[PDB]
Symmetry: C3
Subunit: 130 residues, 3 copies
């Protein structure tokens, strides 16, 4: 099976720790998936960050066990003239273990940054065998 | 089944509204797919934009029914010292049973920018289904 | 089948020519992949490049038969104030049963840049039939 969740905005937040991106959540157990592998793609094509010291955003794919994979974008100037849109994609292939019932997207601030999604973003998964 | 289209260049264009990226289309009808879902990825790993006011490019996945998903990159300086390469990927899942006959990659300008692809880019799809519910 | 390989670090290198990113390797032959196609995704979400002339990195997906797709990121300043993280993804679809034995991720320098991965990156592939 294939799974998909998409949003067209998220509340603007800051957080020093990972917080859920609302709506980017896949219920793997509800899909009847209890083993095998899932290729998970977190696609945030048009984010930006605001801040005062090389802003950016750390993104994660998380399961019941916590963060399984992470990454980030950051700007290359201390205070960008304009905080441009920085497409971001993270792929992680995970084993659906007895204890994996969901996958979700999360994010946290780089250097105090406020985190912005104001258009399409998605979390997708395709199941397969090893 | 897997579907793929790829290109290694496109003409430089400026367009206020969405226009096809030449070569990036999947003829779903000809493939003989009339049900289930496609996970579609538009991958433009090395584009750049030129312009006068924080240049950038919007990209979209469209079907015969319209635009399904879109996004953009933009630079962080008004007139960048050099317009660097800004990898872009867009992922959407579409229901072929709704009447879908094709999938296309499209683009349009941010703030009047000219749009540049001069190397590999792709539009890909993997067929599958939602798991049944009881 | 779904093949995948991931890393959380790689040695820093500088190279004019494509070199393998260690650990980003799929052994298609050993998998005994039925004839068909593989959709391959190379995802390097948090790289950076260091250099003094508009730095960047080229990435490629390669099989035993050669490079099948490549691209790059580059910065927009000659000497970036800081070299920020520049997410990169590359997607290509290859044939199985016509001589492909492996798929790998490779990279090479833009303008003499040193190449940096210090966190999660992956190469994955999903099999299917042709149209
Ligand atoms: C509402 Se303009 C939009 O958002 C700004 C924060 C910048 O990222 C700009 O480049 C983009 O076109
Ligand atoms: C012809 Se140099 C090539 O294209 C330019 C437009 C810039 O994106 C540069 O960083 C890249 O290496
Ligand atoms: C250890 Se700071 C980390 O790596 C640096 C090389 C920069 O890319 C910076 O933006 C990022 O937050
Ligand atoms: Br379905």
């Amino acid at each position: 099976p294939l799974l998909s969740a998409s949003i067209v905005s998220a509340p603007v937040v800051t957080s020093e720790t990972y917080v859920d991106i609302p709506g980017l959540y896949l219920d793997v157990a509800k899909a009847g998936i209890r083993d095998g592998k899932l290729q998970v793609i977190l696609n945030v094509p048009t984010p930006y960050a605001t801040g005062n010291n090389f802003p950016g955003i750390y993104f994660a794919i998380a399961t019941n066990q916590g963060v399984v994979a992470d990454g980030c974008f950051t700007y290359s100037s201390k205070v960008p003239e304009s905080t441009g849109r920085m497409p971001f994609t993270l792929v992680a292939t995970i084993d659906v273990g007895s204890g994996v019932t969901f996958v979700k997207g999360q994010w946290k601030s780089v250097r105090g940054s406020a985190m912005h999604i104001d258009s399409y973003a998605s979390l997708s998964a395709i199941w397969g065998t090893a």
